[PDB]
Design a binder for this molecule. Structure first.
Ligand SMILES: Nc1nc2c(ncn2[C@H]2C[C@H](O)[C@@H](COP(=O)(O)NP(=O)(O)OP(=O)(O)O)O2)c(=O)[nH]1
Ligand SMILES: Nc1nc2c(ncn2[C@H]2C[C@H](O)[C@@H](COP(=O)(O)NP(=O)(O)OP(=O)(O)O)O2)c(=O)[nH]1
Ligand SMILES: [Ca+2]
Ligand code: NA
Length: 901
DNA sequence: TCACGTAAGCAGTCCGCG
DNA sequence: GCGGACTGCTTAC
């Protein structure tokens, strides 16, 4: 097989590399690496090296990396550019692996672990590590085994061995119900004291040293805790055995609020799953506890138990160990579903970077571009420093707040990347500038044509049409790779709806799920075979189709994130190819494109509908336009449609055969106006929305920019069994909105969209009289808690104290002195409740850590003093008032005339 | 919340002007 | 009592 690296590090004058060799074996090598950098030379100093602008360079090969670094300093002091890849790690990888890396994951050691530290005095700070680590579960992906290290004797109590037999028994038999699929993969190791356990773990670590090290919160808790514990017991030098090259570094990670401290183990790639999840999941969660995320992703969660965790090992060592095993397992199940480790490996190997650099799109693109130019012997420019500066972004149309009955949407394919390719935008393709007319003049085609020679953007930039730019070239590759995965996602999605349709009245036979690939549309052979299946098999296939879809989703959307991030990187001062001219050339073109086609779409539909000056385009945002289809439906007549599927078919054909060709002529003309290099504004039908035929639903509404709801029957090529609510921006979509209120407002919107005013009024009346009986966590708001200390004065709110911070201070006063009350953590999230006047907490709200029950100390008080009236007014009634006033509905029967003033 | 971007909405506090 | 300026937080694209 071809070799590929596992990890790379620079330690002084050498590169340390762990890799997989031609035979498939893991090896390690230290290289006295000799890097090269470049300097501009006279046009006569020949050679084959040129900068991206075509100016010649001479190569300078250094004895070692210290020399090359010192040379960079002296050039800065002279005032000349030092060109070439200054991150020597990346130049090494690029030299050693001068080919496309096909990596084999089964040879990569992915370690997944979690620890437990019993602590009587509150949260065990890993800086101090002053409590014995009493359990470790370490999953190895090569061996496919969970290694469990279990401390029998501790100053906090001595316990019996964990029973694998009881662990396997059901909950209803007194057991822990550790899953059947992993019960045989557990290797259990009790130890009579903590020193023996840690010393065995360290040796185990040497035999099976992780390449990728993951888990939940491992970077901020588990790793710094194991490191410091071992350091406190055995010394700094034994602790460094956690690194294959015996070098560590205490990294201080700073943000806009404070500083935290992680441990860098050289020669290991740490991918904390909570970081992978925050970056790649596209969710904003009210809590990031493993149990909460696990329940959201898997519908199950962490093992349950009685009393505080601090007392679990004494009272139930059995459940305590089982719980630790399951926690590790839950992370593995989340990864089987979302596939972020796999994603990380693909991007890392494609870009040729350290795997943990996938958190940095700028690092990723710098390496792809560098590898790309090196193939043609071209030399990358030096990083330069730049003041941060704002620049303009996308266009968003002010919609007239209203109900909108029938709507069709259209959207452009990967807008910013497509613009980069169409216009040919790149650091090396800039050809000059032209004198700019105001933007509306380009939108209306009345301004002078910018160029007959260069490709233009309406911000005044001109680009060469004839030469290739590394940005368009490299963005095209990643965009093309995305296509396949996106196609898998949509196929699974279309197959989802086939399963769902057969679920309405399923056969009741005794059968099994069909063996198919969900990545490709279902053949007619199996569509027929699906109609015979039972509810058990069908729901099972629904699970597999949905899993295939999520995996497809993760693959496609994160490649889109990566290509979108190139457009943004051109606007970030740390990018090597930072240039506000380029970044603005993309966004300005984008805002001309959308408004251009709004004009063309209005022109076309006025012609076809026989009208003058109607606004058919009711809204647009960045890459999308929404078209009112009322008059189109009125041309045929609602009484002439048989059912909902009929008018949806009608609008579908009309968009496909009438509008898209007109829109395509629209964009071709724009392409010629700007004299671009390649036409790539490809805008097609997205959503078809409206009320069900014969109902009183209003179909859809807008309240303002980025705030709207639609009852959708079709999205791209997916036709839906039952209509789907597409809600954007409204409180139902916001993590800060209380769970039960999201559910209630969603059901209010569905009744508005699909059933009408009267149905909305029945539901509202009912929710109003019943909601006081909802669980307090489900009606609590959520907020991130930043700058708690900034507004903290004597443990009381200082000036301008935001409401949710006031809540945290009230909490702190209530749990003061109680060392075992859960503390609010700066930066994390809090539930927030309003309190009635005269309450014992001394303020108008209380907050506590999200994803948790409020401590039993103060729970009964909070429940007695929660302010339902204020809560109902702020989180339910006020937003509902916005929807219904926009949609021109009433959530309460009005006695007379719908008056005002 | 650890070197992709801008646009823009809502909650809540405080102040200047009635 | 109301509107604007502002911080803080959240989403859309
Ligand atoms: N092209 C290029 N190379 C770079 C850059 N930064 C660092 N390097 C490094 C990468 C390379 O290590 C080195 C020169 O790249 P080769 O021409 O591909 N190697 P050669 O043909 O000289 O091999 P032999 O010894 O057989 O003649 O400069 C850069 O910006 N561009
Ligand atoms: N810099 C940057 N620009 C972005 C980002 N997201 C959008 N834009 C700008 C640049 C993009 O080209 C443009 C369109 O966004 P789509 O890529 O189509 N993400 P959507 O979820 O809306 O599409 P789909 O229908 O696939 O879910 O908005 C981002 O994360 N970063
Ligand atoms: Ca889009
Ligand atoms: Na929007």
């Amino acid at each position: 097989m071809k070799e590929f690296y596992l990890t790379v590090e620079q330690i002084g004058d050498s590169i340390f590399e762990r890799y997989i060799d031609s035979n498939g074996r893991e090896r390690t090598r230290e290289v006295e690496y000799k890097p090269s950098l470049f300097a501009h030379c006279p046009e006569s100093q020949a050679t084959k090296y040129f900068d991206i602008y075509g100016k010649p360079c001479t190569r300078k090969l250094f004895a070692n990396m210290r020399d090359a670094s010192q040379w960079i300093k002296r050039m800065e002091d002279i005032g000349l550019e030092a060109l070439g890849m200054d991150d020597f790690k990346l130049a090494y990888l690029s030299d050693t692996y001068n080919y496309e890396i096909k990596y084999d994951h089964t040879k990569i050691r992915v370690a997944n672990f979690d620890i437990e530290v019993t602590s009587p005095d509150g949260f065990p700070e890993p800086s101090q590590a002053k409590h014995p680590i009493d359990a470790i579960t370490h999953y190895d992906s090569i061996d496919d085994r969970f290694y469990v290290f279990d401390l029998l004797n501790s100053p906090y109590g001595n316990v019996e061995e964990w029973s694998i037999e009881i662990a396997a028994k059901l909950q209803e038999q007194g057991g822990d119900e550790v899953p059947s699929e992993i019960i045989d993969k557990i290797i259990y190791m009790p130890f009579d004291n903590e020193k023996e356990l840690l010393m065995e773990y360290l040796n185990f670590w040497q035999q099976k040293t992780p390449v990728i090290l993951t888990g939940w919160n491992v970077e901020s808790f588990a790793i710094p805790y194991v490191y410091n514990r071992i350091k406190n017991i055995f010394g700094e030098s034994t602790a460094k055995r956690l690194s294959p090259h015996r070098k560590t570094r205490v990294k201080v990670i700073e943000n806009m609020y404070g500083s935290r401290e992680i441990i860098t183990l050289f020669g290991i790639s740490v991918l904390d799953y909570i970081d992978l999840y925050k970056k790649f999941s596209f969710t904003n969660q009210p809590s990031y506890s493993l149990d909460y995320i696990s329940e959201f992703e898997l519908n199950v969660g962490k093992l349950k138990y009685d009393g505080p965790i601090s007392k679990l090992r004494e009272s139930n060592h059995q459940r305590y160990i089982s719980y630790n095993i399951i926690a590790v397992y839950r992370v593995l199940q989340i990864d089987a579903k979302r596939q972020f480790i796999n994603l990380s490996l693909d991007m890392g190997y494609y870009a040729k970077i350290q795997i943990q650099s996938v958190f940095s799109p700028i690092k990723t693109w710098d390496a792809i571009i560098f590898n790309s130019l090196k193939e043609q012997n071209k030399v990358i420019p030096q990083g330069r420093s730049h003041p941060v500066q704002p620049y303009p972004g996308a266009f968003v149309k002010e919609p007239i707040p209203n109900r909108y009955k029938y709507v069709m949407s259209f959207d452009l394919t990967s807008l910013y990347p497509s613009i980069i390719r169409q216009v040919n935008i790149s650091p090396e393709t800039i050809a000059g500038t032209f004198k700019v007319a105001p933007l509306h003049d380009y939108i209306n085609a009345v301004a002078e044509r910018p160029s007959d020679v260069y490709s233009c953007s309406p911000n005044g930039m001109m680009y060469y049409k004839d030469r290739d730019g590394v940005v368009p070239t490299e963005i095209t590759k990643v965009f093309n790779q995305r296509k396949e995965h996106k196609g898998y996602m949509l196929a699974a999605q279309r197959n989802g709806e086939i399963i769902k349709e057969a679920l309405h009245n399923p056969n009741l036979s005794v059968d099994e799920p069909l063996d198919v690939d969900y990545r490709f549309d279902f053949s007619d052979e199996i569509k027929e075979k699906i109609k015979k299946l039972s509810a058990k098999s069908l729901n099972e296939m629904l699970f597999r189709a949905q899993r295939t879809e999520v995996a497809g989703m993760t693959a496609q959307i994160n490649r889109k994130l990566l290509i979108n991030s190139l457009a943004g990187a051109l606007g970030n001062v740390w990018f090597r190819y930072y240039d506000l001219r380029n970044a603005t050339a993309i966004t300005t073109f984008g805002q001309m494109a959308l408004q251009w086609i709004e004009r063309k779409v209005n022109e076309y539909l006025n012609e076809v509908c026989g009208t003058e000056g109607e606004a058919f385009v009711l809204y647009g945002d960045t890459d999308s336009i929404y078209v009112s289809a009322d008059k189109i439906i009125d041309k045929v007549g609602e009484s002439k449609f048989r059912d909902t599927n009929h008018w949806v078919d009608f609008l579908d054909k009309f968009a496909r055969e009438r509008m898209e060709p007109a829109i395509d002529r629209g964009f071709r003309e724009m392409c010629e106006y700007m004299n671009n290099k390649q036409h790539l504004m490809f805008m097609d039908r997205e959503a078809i929305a409206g009320p069900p035929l014969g109902s009183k639903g209003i179909g859809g509404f807008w309240t303002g920019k980025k705030r709207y709801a639609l009852n959708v029957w079709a999205m791209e090529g997916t036709r839906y069994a039952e209509p789907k609510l597409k809600i954007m921006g409204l409180e139902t979509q916001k993590s800060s909105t209380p769970k039960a209120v999201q559910k209630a407002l969603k059901e209010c919107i569905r009744r508005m969209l699909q059933e009408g005013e009267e149905s909305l009024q029945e539901y509202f009346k009912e929710f109003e009289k019943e909601f006081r009986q909802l669980n307090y966590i489900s009606i609590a708001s959520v907020s991130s808690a930043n700058n708690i200390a900034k507004y903290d004065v004597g443990g009381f709110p200082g000036p301008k104290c935001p409401f949710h911070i006031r809540g945290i201070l009230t909490y702190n006063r209530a749990i003061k002195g109680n060392i075992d009350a859960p503390q609010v953590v700066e930066g994390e999230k809090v539930y927030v409740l309003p309190l009635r006047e005269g309450n014992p907490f001394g303020d108008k709200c209380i907050a506590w850590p999200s994803g948790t029950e409020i401590t039993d100390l103060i729970k009964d008080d909070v429940l007695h003093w929660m302010d339902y009236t204020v809560l109902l007014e702020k989180t339910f009634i006020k937003p509902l008032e916005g929807f219904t006033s926009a949609a021109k509905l009433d959530y309460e029967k009005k006695a007379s005339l719908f008056d005002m003033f």
